[PDB]
Amino acid sequence: GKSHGYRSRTRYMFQRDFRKHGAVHLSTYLKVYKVGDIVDIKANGSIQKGMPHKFYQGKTGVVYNVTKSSVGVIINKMVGNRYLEKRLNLRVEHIKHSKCRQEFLERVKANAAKRAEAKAQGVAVQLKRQPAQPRESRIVSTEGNVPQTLAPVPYETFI
Amino acid sequence: DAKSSAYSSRFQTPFRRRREGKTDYYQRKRLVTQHKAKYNTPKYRLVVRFTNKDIICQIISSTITGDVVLAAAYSHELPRYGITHGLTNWAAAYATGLLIARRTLQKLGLDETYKGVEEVEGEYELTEAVEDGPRPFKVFLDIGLQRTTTGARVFGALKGASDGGLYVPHSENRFPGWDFETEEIDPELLRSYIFGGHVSQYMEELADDDEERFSELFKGYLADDIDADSLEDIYTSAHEAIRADPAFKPTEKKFTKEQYAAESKKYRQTKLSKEERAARVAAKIAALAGQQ
Amino acid sequence: MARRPARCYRYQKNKPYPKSRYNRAVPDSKIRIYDLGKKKATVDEFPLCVHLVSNELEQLSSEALEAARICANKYITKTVGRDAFHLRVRVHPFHVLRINKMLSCAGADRLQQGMRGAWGKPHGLAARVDIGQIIFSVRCKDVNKPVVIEGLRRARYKFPGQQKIILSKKWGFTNLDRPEYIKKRDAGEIKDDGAFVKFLSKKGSLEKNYNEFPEYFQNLSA
Amino acid sequence: QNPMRDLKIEKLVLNISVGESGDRLTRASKVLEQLSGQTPVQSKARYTVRTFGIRRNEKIAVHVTVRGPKAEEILERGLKVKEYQLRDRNFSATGNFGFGIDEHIDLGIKYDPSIGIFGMDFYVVMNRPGARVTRRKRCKGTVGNSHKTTKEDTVSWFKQKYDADVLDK
Amino acid sequence: KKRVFKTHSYRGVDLEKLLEMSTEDFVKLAPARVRRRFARGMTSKPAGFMKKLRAAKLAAPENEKPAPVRTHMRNMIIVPEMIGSVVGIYNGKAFNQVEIRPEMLGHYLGEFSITYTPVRHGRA
RNA sequence: AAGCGAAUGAUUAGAGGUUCCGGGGUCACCUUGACCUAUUCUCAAACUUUAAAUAUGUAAGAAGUCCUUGUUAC
RNA sequence: GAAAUCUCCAGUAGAACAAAAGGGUAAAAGCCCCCUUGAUUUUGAUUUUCAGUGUGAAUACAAACCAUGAAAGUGUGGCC
RNA sequence: GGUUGCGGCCAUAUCUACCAGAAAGCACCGUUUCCCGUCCGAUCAACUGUAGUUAAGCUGGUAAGAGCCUGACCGAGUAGUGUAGUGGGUGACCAUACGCGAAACUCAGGUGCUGCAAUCU
Known part of the structure; x- marks a missing residue:
């Protein structure tokens, strides 16, 4: 018949990467997780105790609980017309810090830093990010750079 | 013996300190991991190692980017404390065990309390936490790859450390x-x-x-003419000496590390460059095809 | 059972279904010999390389390759002898086609259910081909060229769809263009290996490069 | 040349075969106990072939290993029966070699009743000082090619000892 | 393979000395049965056999066994001038070649030439 | 998609190399029965190094940032 | 004797892990050896199936008491 | 700059051959009273750093080295794919427009990097 076991359709999600099988590198247990940290979920298949369900692999959510060897992660979940809250028992072997949040955090220190000097001199320090603006005008010189012409190449079998 | 490309292409080398064999990562996972409700409280490891002609015992806390050492009291420093001939025996491990204990206790501000055992009868007396006092410094022994075995030197240092007041969990x-x-x-x-x-x-x-074995061996003893029952005296004298001043100082040293580098550079084999790598192949191609 | 017409299995409708441990009970391919002609000639003996290339994406039934192979051999052999050419059937019959076995006897509606559990049993093999993939490759001396093209033309007629006779610029079955292979063969980086040739790489242990290719080092030095 | 690159006697392993089990293993073990001075072990059959009446873990073989000056001495007294000469065969590509005899019971000491007659097998295992590098628990590594053992060094090493010549056939 | 724990002796004749003596002097240390045989007279019956043996011994150097000579006279004695040589002995078929050793010295030749195939009973 | 001169599975063609664990033809005698190595062709839904496009998680703050020092049986 | 047992070398796992397949495992999750019963008690929370119901299975814990280990730690049944 | 103890990233570190190693250190190495363990002081354990020693191990270097890691306007804007068309094509499929864009291949490099502590001509 049909099976929907706790770990079905995971032939490749819990495979250890090529030449990355075996022991988990020891920095994993050394990273410190504080309630409020934003972490993602990448279940290294080697550690079998405390694996997440295959739906959460890649889902990024905050940490709400910190335990002896596990941490509690909150993940929003698509169920019908509403998002549910899913509190997960996750061994730290399957998680890592999200590098997206730290980029925002270091930016905040950068925003605070440049606003600090803006307090002294140079008001209107333009805190907000700017997307890629349309490129301004420029002069394209031709010293030694005469535009060399091109012609479409005739079809050749090349076989 | 003439391996193929497939073996080399798909070979997963274990972590470097396992390739060299010096480090056991299976234990290290459960020696460096921390109860996460103790977020940034580093776990201290009483690392004991046995090189030939010395004993190395250390207190090490494993941070993210490596391991920092509180204090590292080797056994080739016992000559300054009094024990000279014999730097690996069971008594030497116990002496350095108490040394690395008193050194860090005197370093972390717990010398006045936790005097370990003053009169040592070798009893299994763990240093109980003094009432209304800071808890004894709890360190965890990490023997390493050596074998747990009754009457081992590494457990000699263990008994030495705990008897020095440094509360290390263990059993008799x-x-x-x-x-x-x-x-x-x-x-x-x-x-x-x-x-x-x-x-x-x-x-x-x-x-x-x-006389032959007694003379061929223990000929360090013969120079100083110390009796077999005089060993207890020198050991007990050094034990009190270690208790007196374990603060440690680095050796005076000769030829400052700049001279150390300068002289070692000349004898150290250097590495060629790509132009030189391409230079010598011309010699080899000339030698192997020059009217051959 | 009578063989189903090839019109049914023309197209690449189904995903590949090769012989494996999940595909146990299958007959064997009709085509067994893939290299014909003077197959053991050296590379230089047959400079010209001609390809019969499919221009479309369909399935060549295994036995259609065998059917065209006998015809391509037979005109070529009788026109320029046995050993004037070497043809290689590049594509291979790995796709196993399925047939739903049927009863067409009197009142077979009773004993058979129709489409319930209608997974088909293995019917044969076929070669999956896409656009631009070579079907047949003949290599021969250049004066033989009219014969091999016409011989390939007779083989084209056993295949569904449209195929093209392309005169490849490569030196025989090698991956090198004619003018620059001549430079390579002249410079002496080429040792035959029964039917094909070995190339000297600029990378490798020079002692082994010397072992296989002494003439290159002598040619440069001289 | 270099003193510890010279070959030295490291282990001699002595094995037999006894298809069945019972009192025949007692005599087949008391022969080695009196001979080597140390009790051997009875290796258990890993598999069952049924072509020999042997079942799994039947202790069908008695073998012992001897090292040190006793090993050389029992080899010295073990090459008298081999006439301190040997075949070019019996030499492994890794520098080990061996041979098998058919009786040592009244060859070693006076025969005592209920011990019988058994054939005994030798396998000399030679390599050079420093073999601990592949046997220590910590920092286990390998040995250099100059430190390896081949047929060339051992046959040469087998000449100046025992006044022996190889390829007797 | 000649020198073992103890070099075997025949009737008080050392192994190395066992390699030296001729035919005539062996009758002193020979049993009566073989002694009577020689006493009645060995008249050139082994001599033609005995001369080709020396030809084979000289033509064969070390590193290999001497060429297998052959005969039928089961009645011959083991004589020290056949020592260190291999001979096949006729039995009807398929000559069986035996190396002659000093511990073999003085016996007959017919104890090797098994003229009858040993009888095997049972399933086989 | 791509890859098999990369793992497993298949696969066509050859080229070069064996213990007395088979010369089947004169005892070690060229001796056709191997596997191993460097190539060559074509593959794979229940193979894969690698690996898109689309789709997909989170973040883009005032419930935040920084500083000072109070509670706790943790 | 191809295949009885011994010895050595190469051995990225091509073995084994009760049982289907897959994933995972090298001083091990494999083979051997020692001790043991945590395959225990109280409940609660969480994940999958999902109505965020139950059953089943599982993860993390806490209060306990035990087992092992020199210890860290691991263990609330079977590597998943 | 070398060594050791503990390491972080986990082949740029691996692998196969050859060469080199001052001082120190490492190791090999020497011996079995006690502890401990094994068929076997080979493993382990103890003890001497004493008899020696670079032969190893280890470290570094060498290879038009395999491999591994980077890049490349090398392949290739290729294959593929999102969107659209009253586009072509009998169909199979293909081209086009707006986008994204590989992998193999080839070439050019590189062959560990550091962290704590002690030590070394």
Whole structure:
């Protein structure tokens, strides 16, 4: 018949990467997780105790609980017309810090830093990010750079 | 022996310190991991190692990017404390065990309390936390790849450290002088090991029986003319000396590290460059095809 | 059972279904010999390389390759002898086609259910081909060229769809263009290996490069 | 040349075969106990072939290993029966070699009743000082090619000892 | 393979000395049966056999066994001038070649030439 | 998608190399029965190094950032 | 004797892990050896199936008491 | 700059051959009273750093080295794919427009990097 076991359709999600099988590198247990940290979920298949369900692999959510060897992660979940809250028992072997949040955090220190000097001199320090603006005008010189012409190449079998 | 490309292409080398064999990562996972409700409280490891002609015991906390050392009291420093001839025996491990204990306690501000055991009978007396006082510095022994075995030197340092006040969790099962009928360590026998009685009794029994082995061996002893029963004195004198001043100083040194680098650079084999790598192949291609 | 017409299995409708441990009970391919002609000639003996290339994406039934192979051999052999060419059937019959076995006897509606559990049993093999993939490759001396093209033309007629006779610029079955292979063969980086040739790489242990290719080092030095 | 690159006697392993089990293993073990002075072990059959009446873990073989000056001495007294000469065969590509005899019971000491007659097998295992590098628990590594053992060094090493010549056939 | 724990001796004749003596002097240390045989007279019956043996011994150097000579006279004695040589002995078929050793010295030749195939009973 | 001169599975063609664990033809005698190595062709839904496009998680703050020092049986 | 047992070398796992397949495992999750019963008690929370119901299975814990280990730690049944 | 103890990233570190190693250190190495363990002081354990020693191990270097890691306007804007068309094509499929864009291949490099502590001509 049909099976929907706790770990079905995971032939490749819990495979250890090529030449990355075996022991988990020891920095994993050394990273410190504080309630409020934003972490993602990448279940290294080697550690079998405390694996997440295959739906959460890649889902990024905050940490709400910190335990002896596990941490509690909150993940929003698509169920019908509403998002549910899913509190997960996750061994730290399957998680890592999200590098997206730290980029925002270091930016905040950068925003605070440049606003600090803006307090002294140079008001209107333009805190907000700017997307890629349309490129301004420029002069394209031709010293030694005469535009060399091109012609479409005739079809050749090349076989 | 003439391996193919497939073996080399898909070979997963274990972590470097396992390739060299010096590090056991299976234990290290459960020696460096921390109860996460103790977020940034580093776990201290009493690392004990046995090079030949020395003993290395350390207190190490494993941070993210490596391991920092509180204090590292090797055994080739016991000459400044008094023990000179014999730097690996069971008594030497116990002496450096108490040394690395007192050194860090005097470093972390707990010298005044936790005096360990002053009169040492080698009893399994763990340093209980003093009422209304800071808890004893709890360190965890990390023997390494060596084998747990009754009467081992690494557990000699273990008993030495705990007897120095540095509360390290352990049990009396693997101490020397163990009885399989009664689960107790013989105080007379264990303290004999502490003062190096096992070495001393071996010497005096050799001197009783023969002269050749007693003379070919222990010829460090012969220079200073110290009796077998005089070992307890020098060990006890050094034990109090270690208690007196374990603060440690680095050796005076000669030829400052700049001279160390300068002289080592000349003898150290250097590495060629790509132009030189391409230069010499011309010699080899000329030699192997020059009218050959 | 009578063989189903090839019109049914023309297209690449189904995903590949090769012989494996999940595909146990299958007959064997009709085509067994893939290299014909003077197959053991050296590379230089047959400079010209001609390809019969499919211009479309369909399935060549295994036995259609065998059917065209006998015809391509037979005109070529009788026109320029046995050993004037070497043809290689590049594509291979790995796709196993399925047939739903049927009863067409009197009142077979009773004993058979129709489409319930209608997973088909293995019917044969076929070669999956896409656009531009070579079907047949003949290599021969250049004067033989009219014969091999016409011989390939007779073989084209056993195949569904449209195929093209392309005169490849490569030197025989090698991956090198004619003018620059001549430079390579002249410079002496080429040792035959029964039917094909070995190339000297600028990378490798020079002692082994010397072992296989002494003439290159002599040619440069001289 | 270099003193510890010289070959030295490291282990001699002595094995037999006894298809069945019972009192024949007692005599087949008391022969080695009196001979080597140390009790051997009875290796258990890993598999069952049924072509020999042997079942799994039947202790069908008695073997012992001897090292040190006793090993050389029992080899010295073990090459008298081999006439301190040997075949070019019996030499492994890794520098080990061996041979098998058919009786040592009244060859070693006076025969005592209920011990019988058994054939005994030798395999000399030679390599050079420093073999601990592949046997220590910590920092286990390998040995250099100059430190390896081949047929060339051992046959040469087998010449100046025992006044022996190889390829007797 | 000649020198073992103890070099075998025949009737008080050392192994190395066992390699030296001729035919005539062996009758002193020979049993009566073989002694009577020689006493009645060995009249050139082994001589033609005995001369080709020396030809084979000289033509064969070390590193290999001497060429297998052959005969039928089961009645011949083991004589020290056949020592260290291999001979096949006729039995009806398929000559069986035996190396002659000093511990073999003085016996007959017919104890090797098994003229009858040993009888095997049972399933086989 | 791509890859098999990369793992497993298949696969066409050859080229070069064996213990007395088979010369089947004169005893070690060229001796056709191997596997191993460097190539060559074509593959794979229940193979894969690698690996898109689309789709997909989170973040883009005032419930935040920084500083000072109070509670706790943790 | 191809295949009885011994010895050595190469051995990225081509073995084994009760049982289907897959994933995972090298001083091990494999083979051997020692001790043991945590395959225990109280409940609660969480994940999958999902109505965020139950059953089943599982993860993390806490209060306990034990087991092992020198210890860290691991263990609330079977590597998943 | 070398060594050791503990390491972080986990082949740029691996693998196969050859060469080199001052001082220190490492190791090999020497011996079995006690502890401990094994068929076997080979493993382990103890003890001497004493008899020696670079032969190893280890470290570094060498290879038009395999491999591994980077890049490349090398392949290739290729294959593929999102969107659209009253586009072509009998169909199979293909081209086009707006986008994204590989992998193999080839070439050019590189062969560990550091962290704590002690030590070394």
